[PDB]
Amino acid sequence: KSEIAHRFNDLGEKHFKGLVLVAFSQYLQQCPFEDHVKLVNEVTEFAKKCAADESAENCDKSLHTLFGDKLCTVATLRATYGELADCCEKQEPERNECFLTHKDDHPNLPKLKPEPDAQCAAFQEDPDKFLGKYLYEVARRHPYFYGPELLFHAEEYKADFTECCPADDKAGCLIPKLDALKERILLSSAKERLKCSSFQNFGERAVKAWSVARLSQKFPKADFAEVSKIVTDLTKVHKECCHGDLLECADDRADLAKYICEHQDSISGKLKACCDKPLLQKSHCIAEVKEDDLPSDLPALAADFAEDKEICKHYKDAKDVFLGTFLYEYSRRHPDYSVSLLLRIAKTYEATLEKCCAEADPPACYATVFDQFTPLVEEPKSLVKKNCDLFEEVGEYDFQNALIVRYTKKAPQVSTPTLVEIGRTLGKVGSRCCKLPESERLPCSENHLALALNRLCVLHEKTPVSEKITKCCTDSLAERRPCFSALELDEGYVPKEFKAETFTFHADICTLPEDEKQIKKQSALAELVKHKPKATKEQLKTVLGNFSAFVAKCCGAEDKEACFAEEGPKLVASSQLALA
Ligand SMILES: O=C(O)Cc1ccccc1Nc1c(Cl)cccc1Cl
Numbered sequence: 001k002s003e004i005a006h007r008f009n010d011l012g013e014k015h016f017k018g019l020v021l022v023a024f025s026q027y028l029q030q031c032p033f034e035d036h037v038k039l040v041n042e043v044t045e046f047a048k049k050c051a052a053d054e055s056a057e058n059c060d061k062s063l064h065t066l067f068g069d070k071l072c073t074v075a076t077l078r079a080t081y082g083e084l085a086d087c088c089e090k091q092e093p094e095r096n097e098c099f100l101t102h103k104d105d106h107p108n109l110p111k112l113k114p115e116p117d118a119q120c121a122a123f124q125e126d127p128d129k130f131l132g133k134y135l136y137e138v139a140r141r142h143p144y145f146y147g148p149e150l151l152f153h154a155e156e157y158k159a160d161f162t163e164c165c166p167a168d169d170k171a172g173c174l175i176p177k178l179d180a181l182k183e184r185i186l187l188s189s190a191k192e193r194l195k196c197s198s199f200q201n202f203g204e205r206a207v208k209a210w211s212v213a214r215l216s217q218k219f220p221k222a223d224f225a226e227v228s229k230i231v232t233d234l235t236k237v238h239k240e241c242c243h244g245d246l247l248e249c250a251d252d253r254a255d256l257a258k259y260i261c262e263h264q265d266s267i268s269g270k271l272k273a274c275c276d277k278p279l280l281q282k283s284h285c286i287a288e289v290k291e292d293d294l295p296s297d298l299p300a301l302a303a304d305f306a307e308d309k310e311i312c313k314h315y316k317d318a319k320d321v322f323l324g325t326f327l328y329e330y331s332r333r334h335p336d337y338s339v340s341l342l343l344r345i346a347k348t349y350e351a352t353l354e355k356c357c358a359e360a361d362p363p364a365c366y367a368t369v370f371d372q373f374t375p376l377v378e379e380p381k382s383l384v385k386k387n388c389d390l391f392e393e394v395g396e397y398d399f400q401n402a403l404i405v406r407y408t409k410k411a412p413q414v415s416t417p418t419l420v421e422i423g424r425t426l427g428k429v430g431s432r433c434c435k436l437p438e439s440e441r442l443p444c445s446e447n448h449l450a451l452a453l454n455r456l457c458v459l460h461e462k463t464p465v466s467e468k469i470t471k472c473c474t475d476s477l478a479e480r481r482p483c484f485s486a487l488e489l490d491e492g493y494v495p496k497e498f499k500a501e502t503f504t505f506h507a508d509i510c511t512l513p514e515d516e517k518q519i520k521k522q523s524a525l526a527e528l529v530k531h532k533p534k535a536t537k538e539q540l541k542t543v544l545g546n547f548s549a550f551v552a553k554c555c556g557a558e559d560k561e562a563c564f565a566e567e568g569p570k571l572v573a574s575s576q577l578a579l580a
């Protein structure tokens, strides 16, 4: 009868309101908080009426119809969102699609800087309004953020203020917590956004393949039936969440967690800790669970995948099940491979069968199929080792610098703030991944790389500037990283005209916290490359060293600006001689 009543009944009022606030903030990213609150309360009032009498008027409409109808009542819709008032002319599902298109991946809203006294005050004042605020602020900023996980993060955010606002050192307790939390949020947003990008750009089959490979590594004791089931269900959850159907998404998510925990003994022994937990923590723990130990009864794969004489008939009869089975088997025994690598191995298996089966004696041809995986494996392994050796030698900041230069050369048309952001993110990947046990570094690195590359691709959809990026971003999901790695200096690139101001620092840099100081220097680095694209990485490092020395000296001077004004312009000119 009434979907809205059904979801209201299933989720309860608290989770329902939270999810509806999230969905509205993601769809209308510029509205003030107070106004979204009103819309939520009205939707929720309706849901309560409907739960009382489902026969009642309009109780029978779709969620998207009801929710889209609300969004369309917003005051100043045409002033604030010029592009969205046309959407309101349309019916479902055409209206939702239109809303989905308008979501803004880089709204560029002010940075959320933890102010512990002003926030503790607001929290003590009204914790409900304060937590609502956190849902709204994050959601607007990350419009494909995994809705139910955001509620989870609100619990953490609430726990942080609960523990820290009474403390002796309130800023000392709190600032490191909110910083860790923000890192976790950024990572989670990027993961989810890759899933939504994958549905958008490559389709559900790609998402399923990704998930089969990843879940098989996580749950290598599970049989293919159980993996298939989980994948099918998990794919439907994320498809709903990526489509804006957050209530349906959350409900289906809760059903999957329930299933997983009832079957935990045949899925993974690491799930025991997760299943002993309240609802949102449970789902979160499942989503993040570590990989189980390999069972001792993993089957040898040659017999079915390389030696069987009827492989060409099985491949032809049920490609999807046969290849899926291959992917499940190979992935469960390879937690030391990245997901994308496993997908490349699966595509190579597929292509080898295609080739061998259109041939005189196929079996003598596909006998050696596993041997074709070797180079796919060895190349990223040596890339990771080389990158991690560099990180360990130079540290995060200089590793970031190296990546900035690398990516600026590959795509000098991209805006400096984007290049800096991706290079900085890539350096953080190094900090995360390079210190792991050595068998974990390839999957950690490549998997996280995929998140950063996807960010760049998402931004480029919004603001296209390079055909080379478009091609890497759209050709093949599993080949994206290798495609980016293979990019070299864009040789058709005309060096950006020199503007001395870009390289000209002033005493204002001296008051910045370290990370913002680095960003300024990294921005100037990216600009050096744009103006001198053939400068070598070693020249660039020297010049950047000369700039950092100059900044540090002038920042410690008696008269900071006189220092910057005297010495700056010499450095700016001589630095150009030191490049290309
Ligand atoms: O960057 C590349 O193209 C090489 C490569 C290949 C596979 C996986 C990772 C990396 N690079 C890499 C690594 Cl291994 C760690 C931190 C940051 C980066 Cl960019």
Ligand SMILES: O=C(O)Cc1ccccc1Nc1c(Cl)cccc1Cl
Residues within 6 Å of the ligand: 390, 394, 398, 399, 401, 402, 403, 405, 406, 536, 537, 538, 540, 541, 542, 544
């Ligand atoms: O990109 C690399 O291969 C690392 C590399 C090696 C030698 C010299 C410089 C660099 N990278 C690099 C750059 Cl390009 C700028 C500033 C600081 C560093 Cl460590």
